[PDB]
Amino acid sequence: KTNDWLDEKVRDALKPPS
Amino acid sequence: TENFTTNLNQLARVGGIDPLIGREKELERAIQVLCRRRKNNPLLVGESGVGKTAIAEGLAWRIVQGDVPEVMADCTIYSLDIGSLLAGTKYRGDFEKRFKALLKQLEQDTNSILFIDEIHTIIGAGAASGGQVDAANLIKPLLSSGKIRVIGSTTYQEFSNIFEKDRALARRFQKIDITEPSIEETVQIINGLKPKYEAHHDVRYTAKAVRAAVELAVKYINDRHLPDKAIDVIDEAGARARLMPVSKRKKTVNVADIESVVARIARIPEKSVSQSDRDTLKNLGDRLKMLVFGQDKAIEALTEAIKMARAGLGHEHKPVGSFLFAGPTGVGKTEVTVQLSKALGIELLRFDMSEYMERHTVSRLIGAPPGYVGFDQGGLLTDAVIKHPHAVLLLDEIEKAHPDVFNILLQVMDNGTLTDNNGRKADFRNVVLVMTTNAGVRETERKSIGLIHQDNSTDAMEEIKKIFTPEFRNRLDNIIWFDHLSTDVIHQVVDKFIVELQVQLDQKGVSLEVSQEARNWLAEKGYDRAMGARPMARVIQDNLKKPLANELLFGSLVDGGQVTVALDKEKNELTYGFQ
Amino acid sequence: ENFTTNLNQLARVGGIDPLIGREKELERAIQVLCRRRKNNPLLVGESGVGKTAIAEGLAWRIVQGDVPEVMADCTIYSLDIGSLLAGTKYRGDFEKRFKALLKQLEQDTNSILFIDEIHTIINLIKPLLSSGKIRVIGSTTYQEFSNIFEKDRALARRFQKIDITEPSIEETVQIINGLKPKYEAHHDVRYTAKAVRAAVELAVKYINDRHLPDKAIDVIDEAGARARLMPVSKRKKTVNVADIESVVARIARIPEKSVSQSDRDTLKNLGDRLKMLVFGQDKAIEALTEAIKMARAGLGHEHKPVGSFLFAGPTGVGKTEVTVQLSKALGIELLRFDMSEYMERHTVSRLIGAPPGYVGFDQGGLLTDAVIKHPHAVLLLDEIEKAHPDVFNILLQVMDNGTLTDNNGRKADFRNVVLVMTTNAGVRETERKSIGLIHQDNSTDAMEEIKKIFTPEFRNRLDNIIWFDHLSTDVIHQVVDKFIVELQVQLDQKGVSLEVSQEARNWLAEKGYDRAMGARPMARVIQDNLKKPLANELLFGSLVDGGQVTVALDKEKNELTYGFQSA
Ligand SMILES: Nc1ncnc2c1ncn2[C@@H]1O[C@H](COP(=O)(O)OP(=O)(O)OP(O)(O)=S)[C@@H](O)[C@H]1O
Ligand SMILES: Nc1ncnc2c1ncn2[C@@H]1O[C@H](COP(=O)(O)OP(=O)(O)O)[C@@H](O)[C@H]1O
Ligand SMILES: Nc1ncnc2c1ncn2[C@@H]1O[C@H](COP(=O)(O)OP(=O)(O)O)[C@@H](O)[C@H]1O
Incomplete structure (x- = not known):
């Protein structure tokens, strides 16, 4: 009767003011 | 970096850091590791x-x-916060x-050392x-090079599974075992x-109060380890002492207050820890009569066995009492x-x-x-005893239990502890083990076959020996017949x-009177030699409770609150009068 | 300030409702806050609740000011999870x-932060708790505590568990x-x-949905809103017990009769209703x-279940x-x-x-949670003879103590549920024919079968054997x-009219119904015999329009004859 046990950061772009 | 890192040395001067007591051996190991040319990261x-x-x-x-060696002097300890970073x-x-900015500051100052609590999280x-x-x-490169020294704190379970999986990080650090040396140090530490x-x-x-707190928590509070739990009970006692003085009352902390504090953590009745209830124990037998x-x-x-346990003469590791009751079923x-x-x-x-x-x-x-x-x-027995450390353990029909169950009880009685699948240590020495068996009655009640009868004085004892292995009998404190x-x-x-039935009816507002002769009739039918008093509950339940309930909802009882019980001699059946 | 509102300042101006009772619970919360360490109440x-x-x-x-001097100046702020x-x-x-908000509280000493539904965030x-500068109040569900707090050692050590238990029936009415x-x-x-006290009892017994105290407060406000809104409020300046029950019908989803008090009234009508x-x-x-009558009277042990029933005979005995x-x-x-x-x-x-x-x-336990989901729900068991003897033993335990304990630790009370069982031992023995040159009836008493199949203790604890x-x-x-009536109403919507001869009903009855199988085969026999022949005609044939149908049997061949008219 055994049982088997199964087992954010992104770059951004900047826009300078026109 | 200042937000993420706090200077322990600067904070220590102001205060906050409690004085360390009796850790010279542990501290000495740390300095030796820190002075090493490479891998100078004590763990x-x-x-x-602890x-x-x-x-x-x-x-x-x-x-x-300035109580450390000269080399250690002129050093700064920094506590890194992983969560903030x-x-x-x-x-x-x-x-x-x-992170690189933080490392640069430590690298710039050779003397500076870092402390990372719960270092297992970073790996x-x-x-x-x-x-x-x-x-x-x-x-990893910096620790191997020796540019920066890092102190770590990890639990044994966390250190074994989360940590040490990566051999590269593990080798750099130097394991230092930390264990509470003794109970006397804890009171000294407090x-x-x-x-x-x-x-x-x-x-x-x-x-007396400080010493009493550590001892009481050890025996009763098993949720946490000895140093933290001892500090916790003395800390909570102060809060109790704070509430009581409404107007110029005593501020001293008494042992009685600490006894109440340990009781709250364990949620026990508090009667066992306190000695003010000796009168109840003194009259426990009389009450049982x-x-x-x-x-x-x-x-x-x-x-008698409970009295010696409170008196301090009970077994240090065995249960309070082990008793086997061998008698006819239904005799109490x-x-x-x-x-x-x-x-x-x-x-x-x-x-x-x-x-x-x-x-x-x-x-x-x-x-x-x-x-x-x-x-x-989790195990049923281990869960129950852990949940209720102070309780009465009742085993019925022990003789019918498989031999494997008997083996488990041997360690329970001899050592007072049982280990479950999870490996937790279940300590329930306070419970009093009592087992009930019906094996002995058969031999004594039955007469010996043959023309001339034979003495049955030792037949009952012989049955106990055959059914129960000798090692099991040794652990038992006494066998009562x-x-x-x-x-x-x-x-x-x-x-x-009838008193129980009368008391139940009294709350409802009905008064019951039972004829003395009727009680005798109920006794004979309800009580059976082989079954003892077992059928008496069913006879009283069916015969008396069912008819009365009908009138209680609607009938004479709802309007008048009176009922009577009588017996019919001709029919030999109970007759109930409702008014 | 914007992210977290000030409860203490809010109470000073109003809005907060005065708390009645819970003196012991509030006392412990104050005690932990006064502690030097581990002062975060939970x-x-x-x-x-x-x-x-x-x-x-x-x-x-x-x-x-009903607090110690140390806690007199403390300020409780409720962190808004949604706002952040x-x-x-x-x-x-x-x-x-959160860092900015925490900095403000950290700057001001003796500041208390209340994180409602803290389990949602975690x-x-951990850092605020470890620092200890600001103590924090945390409200978490019992289920979430095991899943999150117990698993994390650091969170559990800092937070102290304060058990908040629902008030008793008497306490709930007192709060209202x-x-x-x-x-x-x-x-x-x-x-x-009378109405407020009745609201607590009627709400919990019938709705059984949110909480014992919560339902009481919700049921009282709901009743007042309906009565005051109605124009009758001028004439009706008080709330009758029945008025709340009528309003409770909206949140009950059952008729007013069910919600209406029927503790003693149901007994008389229920007997008539069954017939x-x-x-x-x-x-x-x-x-x-008779068995359930005992529970209503109340002359019985509280733990003992409401009623114990038994059924015997062929499958489909009602x-x-x-x-x-x-x-x-x-x-x-x-x-x-x-x-x-x-x-x-x-x-x-x-x-x-x-x-x-x-x-x-x-x-957890499917049978056990069913009782927990509905406290008063009846439990119907069937063909218990098949089940292993070991399974049947657990039934004996609950019958005696009237309580059960799940593996997960949940406790179920059987004091409010009636247990009934169904047995079909009779059909197996009676159908068998005696091994003799001349056959004999093999029917046996049902009570005899119950005794052999089940252990004696089961019958002893059972109030009575019902056949x-x-x-x-x-x-x-x-x-x-x-x-046929059910089929008849179904056809009337489509516009088809079906007429069945009295002899036809008797003809189906003899072959369809079986002693061993009871009325189960008759149901199936009526579907194939009637639905199948008309079905072909309904799609295409005489019954496409008009729907004139006649059902009769021929005595000579003993076969049903179906007459279809175009109409
Ligand atoms: N000396 C006694 N005084 C009062 N009641 C007694 C006495 N001896 C036995 N009884 C009653 O006998 C009944 C059964 O006794 P127990 O020792 O509990 O046996 P049991 O077989 O466990 O009983 P059950 O639970 O009713 S099947 C209970 O009603 C007891 O209170
Ligand atoms: N040797 C000791 N000297 C002084 N205080 C101690 C000592 N051991 C324990 N304590 C006290 O008890 C606490 C033990 O908790 P700690 O070891 O920090 O827990 P954890 O290892 O779970 O982080 C210390 O913070 C301190 O308050
Ligand atoms: N013991 C009690 N005393 C007073 N009000 C209570 C009590 N228990 C519940 N309440 C009521 O509960 C309502 C909702 O608050 P609460 O039950 O704490 O919310 P939640 O279900 O989100 O935890 C409040 O309006 C309050 O009056």
């Missing part, structure tokens, strides 16, 4: 609440007071830049999730911390157990041994081992039953 | 907002009475003392009524009918578990185990008419 591994963090923080306090990054390079996921650029990888705790609550701890009677030895044997063996828990105001633990009639059933009480379906579910109920006792049992 | 509880109100009541007490999380929708942006919770003057002033109409829809076997239903009607009459949800599937280790584990998933911890009389031929004829 403190110990159980929860002063693991205090040792690292204490080093800063010791340096401030991880929070607010929200970018791939935010964590790396701040799992230090900087990024789903990426291999973790915090540990960043410091004395050093007594001024800080006393000032916060504006209370004073007596010498009002309860199930007819066995002068059962009440005397059980009451089971009731003595349930009539003693109510009187003592403690929980009652009852297990049906008949259910545990096969070898596979024993695994239910201790749990299935790892890698199986039942590992998730229950004599057959006399006619007067059987009639007395009915009187209690 | 108001563990359930939804509607008032844990959030306890925090609001604690803030009111501080301004009132909303408007960011990013990972780490939310944390930055990186920064304490808060009744506030409500009466708000809408200018009052509730009778209204069931023909004959008055003795059998009388046995069922076990579903009487149980469904009994459940309807008692206004209790019908819960039925079939022992027919419990014939293997995996299947028998289902009573207390969680077959759906080992990972799943919420379900349901076998079906009668007159009932079968009526049953045939009911199915």
Whole structure:
């Protein structure tokens, strides 16, 4: 009767003011 | 970096860091590791609440007071906060830049040392999730080179599984074992911390009070380890002392207050710890006489054993008392157990041994081992005793239990402890083990075959020896035999039953009167020699309770609140008058 | 300030409702806060128990001054999870907002932060606790505490578990009475003392949905709103007990009769109601009524279950009918578990185990949770003979103590549920023919079969052995008419009219109904015989329009003859 046990950061772009 | 990192040395001068007491051996090992040319990163591994963090923080306090070696002097200890550093990054390079910035400050100052509490967290996921650029990888070259020294704190379970999986990080650090040396050091340690705790609550701890707190928590509070739990009970006692002085009352902390504090943590009745209830224990036997009677030895044997336990003469590691009741079924063996828990105001633990009639059933009480379906579910016996450390354990029909169950009880009686599948240590020495068997009655009640009868004085004892292995009998403190109920006792049992029914009706507002002759008739039919007093409850239930209930809802009882019981001689059937 | 509101300042101006009772619970919360370390109270509880109100009541007490001098100047702020999380929708942006808020509280000493539903958030919770500069109040559900707090050693050590238990029945009405003057002033109409006390009892017994105290407060406000809104409020300046029950019908989803008090009234009508829809076997239903009559009187042990019933005979002996009607009459949800599937280790584990998933911890025991989901629901068991003897033993345990304990630790009380069982041992023995040159009837007494199949202790604990009389031929004829009537109403919507001869009903009755199988085959026999022939014609043929149908039988060939008219 055994049982088997199964087992954010992104770059951004900047826009300078026109 | 200042937000993420706090200077322990600067903080220690102001205060906050408690004085470290009696850790010279542990501290000396740390300095030796720190003075090493390479891999000078001591790791403190110990159980929860063993002063693991205090040792690292204490080093800063010791340096401030100049009680450390000259090489250690002129050094700064920095406590890194992993949570603050991880929070607010929200970018791939935010964590790396701040972490690298922190390392640069430590690298610039050779004397500076870092402290990372719960260092196991960084190796799992230090900087990024789903990426291999973790915090540990960043410091692995630096730690090997020896540019920066890092102190670590980890639990044994966390150190074994989360940590040491990566051999590269593990080798750099140097494992230092931390264990509480003795109970006497803890009381000594609390004395050093007594001024800080006393000032916060504006209370004073007596010498007897501080020693009493550590001892009481050890025996009763098993949720936490000895150093932390001892500090916790003396800390909570101050709060109790704070509430009571509404207007110019005494601020001293008494042992009675501490006794109440330990009781709250364990949620026990508090009667066992306090000695003010000696009167109840003194009259425990007399009270039991009002309860199930007819066995002068059962009440005397059980009451005497409890008294010695409170007096301090009980077994240090064995249960309070081990007793086997061999007598006819229905003579009160089971009731003595349930009539003693109510009187003592403690929980009652009852297990049906008949259910545990096969070898596979024993695994239910201790749990299935790892890698199986039942590992998730804890053992029934271990869960019950852990949940209720102070309670009455009742085993019925022990003789029918599989031999495997008997083996489990051997360690329980001899050592007072049982280990479940999870490996937790279940300590329930306070419980009084009582077992009830019906094996002996058969031999004595039955007459010997043949023309001339034979003495049955030793037949009952012989049966116990055959059914129960000798090793099991040795652990048992005493074996008590229950004599057959006399006619007067059987009639007395009915009187209690009518009183119980009368008391139940009194609350409802109905008054019941039962003829004395009617009680005698009920006694004969209800009581059976082989079954003892077992059928008396059913006879009283069906015969009397069912008819009265009908009138209670609607009839004479609802309007008049009066009822009577009579017997018909011609029909030999009870007749009830409702008014 | 913007992210977290000030409860203490709010109570000073108003809005917060005064807290009545909970003196011991509030006392412990004050005690932990005064501690040097591990001073973070945790108001563990359930939804509607008032844990959030306890925090609001604690803030009111501080301004009132019913607290120690150390706690007199403390300020409780309730962190708004929605405010900080909303408007960011990013990972780490939310944390930055929390850092700023934490800095403000850290700067001011003796500041208390209240994180309602803290389990939802749980990186920064651990540092504030470890620092100890600001103590924090946390409200988490009992289930979430095991999942999150128990698993994390650091969180558990800092937070102290304060058990928040629901008040007793008497306590719940007292809370409403304490808060009744506030409500009466708000809408200018009052509730009778009988009405408020009755609201607590009627709400919990029938709705059984949110919380014992929460339902009481919600039911009183709902009743007042309906009465005051109605124009009759001028003439009606008080709330009748029945008026609340009528309003409770909206949140009950059952008729007013069910909600109406029927503790003693149901007994008389229930007996008549069982006979209204069931023909004959008055003795059998009388046995069922007698056992439940005991519970209503109340002259019994509280732990003992409400009632114990038993059924014997062939499959389909009205076990579903009487149980469904009994459940309807008692206004209790019908819960039925079939022992027919419990014939293997995996299947028998289902009573207390969680077959759906080992990972799943919420379900636990399926049979056990069913009682928890509906406290008053009836439990119907069938074909218990099949089940293993070991499974049957657990039934004996609950019957004696009237309580059960799940593997997960949940405790179920059987004091409010009636247990009935169905047995079909009779059909197997009677159908068999004696091994003799001349056959003999093999029918045996039902009571004899119960004794051999089940252990003696089961019968002893059982109040009585109930044997349901076998079906009668007159009932079968009526049953045939009911199915035709059911088919008849279904055809009237389409516009088809079906007429069945009296002889036709009798003809189907003899072959269809079986003694061993009861009325189950008759049902199936009526579907194939009538639905199949008309079905072809309905799609294409004479019955496409008009729908004139006639049913008759031919005596010579003993076969049903169907006449179709185009009409
Ligand atoms: N001396 C006594 N005084 C009063 N009641 C007694 C006495 N001896 C036995 N009884 C009653 O006998 C009944 C059964 O006694 P137990 O020792 O509990 O046996 P049991 O077989 O466990 O009983 P059950 O639980 O009723 S099947 C209870 O009602 C007891 O209170
Ligand atoms: N040797 C000691 N000297 C002084 N205080 C101690 C000592 N051991 C324990 N303590 C006190 O008890 C606490 C133990 O908790 P700690 O070891 O920090 O827990 P954890 O290892 O779970 O982080 C210390 O913080 C301190 O207050
Ligand atoms: N013991 C109590 N005393 C006073 N009000 C209570 C009590 N228990 C619950 N309440 C009521 O509960 C309502 C909702 O608060 P609460 O139950 O704490 O919310 P939640 O279900 O979100 O935890 C409040 O209006 C409060 O009056």
